[PDB]
Amino acid sequence: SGAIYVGNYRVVNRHLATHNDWANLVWEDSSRDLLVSSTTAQGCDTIARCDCQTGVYYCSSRRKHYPVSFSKPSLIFVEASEYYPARYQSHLMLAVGHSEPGDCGGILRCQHGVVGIVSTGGNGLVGFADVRDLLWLDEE
Ligand SMILES: COCc1ccccc1CC(=O)N1CCC[C@H](C(N)=O)C1
Numbered sequence: 649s650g651a652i653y654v655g656n657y658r659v660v661n662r663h664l665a666t667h668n669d670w671a672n673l674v675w676e677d678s679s680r681d682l683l684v685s686s687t688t689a690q691g692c693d694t695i696a697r698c699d700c701q702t703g704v705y706y707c708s709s710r711r712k713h714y715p716v717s718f719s720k721p722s723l724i725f726v727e728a729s730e731y732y733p734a735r736y737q738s739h740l741m742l743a744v745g746h747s748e749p750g751d752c753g754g755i756l757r758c759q760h761g762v763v764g765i766v767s768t769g770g771n772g773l774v775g776f777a778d779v780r781d782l783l784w785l786d787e788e
C-alpha cells in the first residue's frame with residue numbers, strides 16, 4: 649500500500665484505488681496501473697522532472713529503503729493476476745530488487761523528487777509505474 653500526495657492530488661495504484669477515489673477522479677489509465685484523485689488538503693511531495701536511472705525505493709515487506717538502478721519507462725508484459733488479465737503495462741520501469749504482493753504503492757525517489765510507485769514484482773525483480781511525464785501534477 650502507499651500513495652503520492654502532490655498539491656491537491658493523490659496518486660495511487662489503480663488496482664488499489666478506493667470507492668472515494670473513483671468518485672473524486674481526475675485521471676486514470678488501466679494500461680499504466682495509475683489513478684489520480686482530488687484531495688481537500690495540500691500534499692508535500694515533489695515530482696521529479698528528469699531522466700535519472702538510479703534512486704531509492706521503499707520495500708514494505710522488508711521495512712527497508714533500497715538503492716536501485718532501474719530501466720527507462722517501457723511497455724512490459726505483465727502476467728495475469730486477480731486485478732488484470734495478462735497484458736502489456738506501459739510506462740513501467742524494472743529493477744533487480746525484492747518485491748512481494750503488498751509492496752505496491754512504495755515510493756521510488758531520486759535527487760529530484762518522486763519518480764514513481766511500486767506496481768509489479770517478479771523473482772528478484774521490482775517494477776515501478778513512472779509519474780515523471782505527468783507534468784499537469786505540478787499545476788492547478
Ligand atoms: C509489488 O510486487 C507485487 C508482486 C511481487 C511478486 C510477485 C507478484 C506480484 C504481484 C504483481 O506483480 N501484480 C499483482 C497486482 C497488479 C500488478 C499490475 N500492475 O498488473 C501485478
Ligand SMILES: [Zn+2]
Nearest residue numbers: 698700758760
Ligand atoms: Zn532525477
